[PDB]
Design a protein around this ligand. Sequence first.
Ligand SMILES: [Fe+2]
Ligand SMILES: [Zn+2]
Length: 349
Amino acid sequence: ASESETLNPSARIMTFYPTMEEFRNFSRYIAYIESQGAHRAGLAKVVPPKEWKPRASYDDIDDLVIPAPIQQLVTGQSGLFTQYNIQKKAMTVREFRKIANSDKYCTPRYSEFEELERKYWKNLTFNPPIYGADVNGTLYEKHVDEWNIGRLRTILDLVEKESGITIEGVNTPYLYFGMWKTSFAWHTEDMDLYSINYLHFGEPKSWYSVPPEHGKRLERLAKGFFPGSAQSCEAFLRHKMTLISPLMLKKYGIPFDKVTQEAGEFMITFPYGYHAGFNHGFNCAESTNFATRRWIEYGKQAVLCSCRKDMVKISMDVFVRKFQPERYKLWKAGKDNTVIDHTLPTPEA
Ligand SMILES: [Fe+2]
Ligand SMILES: [Zn+2]
């Protein structure tokens, strides 16, 4: 009964409301969140203190360019789907919001979320929406020094500092313009990093997540339903094309939790935390990945996509050598047999 029982084996999604004081130091608050067990659910929500905002107004923006809008074509039945991404073409934000609101792409009448969620799972294969995803850029004003996705100051910076290597969306910020029914397939971050997502404005974004302690179970299930993909790639889920309904997870005993994120709220994914979801309507989110000392081990063991030749791969060398000098030799010689304890928070006894 070692002190793992923080987010007692309920590993549920937790919500936090930090003080402007606690809020100032990013890396510190993540450590606090983990001491409260929030990482056990794979996903956590953080509401910024009232007197905080990254930008004055988003009135000056409909001119921003979405260089690679994506139409999401979904195929499948009864809980299991595969999403193909048809890349449309150059588009301005003004053109997007108009389509996003056009009565044939807009959200429909719904009482409770429970109902909006049902309409989503019943109609996701109809009316292929468009998602203004992976747009390089930020909406934070240069002076915002708290939780600025553009410069979080975490050790993920070592990658940049050590080799000058830049990785869009990972090492850099991304903007996501949503629309109803636009969704993100089940996945963990590249190299099993952490991710931070801020919903600048618009309709909500709902999230589903599986506790990292049960991530392996989700993979076994995924492999079983798509044996074809599982054989061609060691980590086919990283392709971000697999959708699985909450009802299917329920049916096969895979533990998970739900949460809806609203404008002005932060979402944090944790190492090896599988997540997925969908946007309610016209949206705008920003995200990037970040690391922590606790992440290093996950990074060393992350199973990567073996079929695409332009998929993200970060050299762990600088991390092991810098934060695990005693194990560098062991590791560098394919020996280090460290088992990960998903409950344990960064600091160790
Ligand atoms: Fe993600
Ligand atoms: Zn692959």
